[model samples]
Target: MGRLVVVVTSEQLKEEVRKKFPQVEVRLVTTEEDAKQVIKEIQKKGVQKVVLVGVSEKLLQKIKQEANVQVYRVTSNDELEQVVKDVKGSGLEHHHHHH
Candidate 1:
């Protein structure tokens, strides 16, 4: 879990993503091969999250089964921001740590 990753359709979101989420990686998957490759990257990279915008139900289910991969089923900009904020706050929860 090093950085945040987002799963999008042909379209993408970028409003809430300024500096706090500058490093967010957007992976667009519209085929079995694309999803499979993204899954492989999720495992290889240590990236813990996959924010979905618009995707197939079956593919979503598959990603949910991924080991240790935090699949966030977000559909709106606000929800996406909320999820990111929640994770960021928890990640910086320790007294010695700060966001």
Candidate 2:
């Protein structure tokens, strides 16, 4: 598992991401309350990045407005391409790919 945390817009996005990247489960951040609450916790967990999928550009922009988000970066790359690289950038020790 890796320390890279991610946020998908919905279950579909989750499926899409997983379907595309089996090596990315460990870093996929979950949403408890409209996605904000869980992301908040991840910030404290030393997460440095977030990814958004299955969301419109408007929704992406809205999430980008999260003022309290600290120590992490947010990107609209729903495809998980860059997120994968960034997480992997830290090496396998920071990455977990499991159910």
Candidate 3:
């Protein structure tokens, strides 16, 4: 397993993720193509788990089917927290201290 990558659409969500997991690599993606590109890049780097946020149902389904990694959707702050906890529990590197 590699580091968790959070693909988000909004800066607010990205900021939230940063606040929770400062060391985690988070990318801002506003479109489906951006999401696909991020997933592709992560996969090429051997990343196995990725969390995508602020995506539509259709876009999420598409990525879920195509990406070669575990994709978790961010629906709320609580869910985001859980994802971070899961990543930590999995023994992946993360930045817990955030602004």
Candidate 4:
């Protein structure tokens, strides 16, 4: 299976990522608290690589400081698209759903 991509509470960003990277699961988290919870779960599942979407500088910094895994910020749609493509090309399988 492929690494997961977590978008910080932004449906628009999540949708864009889903379109570009259908193989990787895209999850939407509504709050920083939820993000932390999701991070914990992902880490426990042995998910090493993660792209954190729509995260602010403050929250991104917090995640970097708190988490042991790699976390990347999604600033623009273009960047998000590129990251998704890169992750998919890296040979990881993923599933995504929208609520």
lDDT of 2 by residue, 3-93 (tens): 5545665665667656656666523334334555544555566554555555446545555566234223334433356567766764333
Residues 1-99 of candidate 1: C-alpha lDDT, one tens digit per residue: 366777765543433343335446677776768888878888887777777666778888887786358888877666666666655765422222224
Q: Model 1 RMSD to the real structure?
A: 6.6
Q: What is the C-alpha RMSD of each candidate to the true structure, in Å?
A: 6.6, 7.4, 4.7, 6.4
Clashing pairs in 3: none
Badly placed stretches (over 4 Å) of model 1 are 12-20, 87-99
The candidates, ranked best first by TM-score, are 3, 4, 1, 2
Q: Which stretches of candidate 4 lie over 4 Å from their true place?
A: 90-99
Pairwise lDDT winner, candidates 1 and 4: 4
Q: Which one wins on lDDT?
A: 3
Per-residue lDDT over 1-99 for candidate 4, one digit per residue giving the tens place of the 0 to 100 score: 457655556887677666755676776777778778776767676776677776767767776666677776766665555566665666443434335
lDDT tens string, model 3, 1-99? 568788788888888778777757888887667777886777687768778777788877777778756888887666667777776775344434555
How high a TM-score does candidate 4 get?
Answer: 0.71
Count of clashes in candidate 1:
0
Model 4 deviation from the true structure expressed as Cα RMSD, one decimal place:
6.4
TM-score of each: 0.69, 0.50, 0.78, 0.71
Q: Pick the candidate with the highest TM-score.
A: 3
Instruction: Pick the winner on lDDT between candidates 1 and 2.
Output: 1
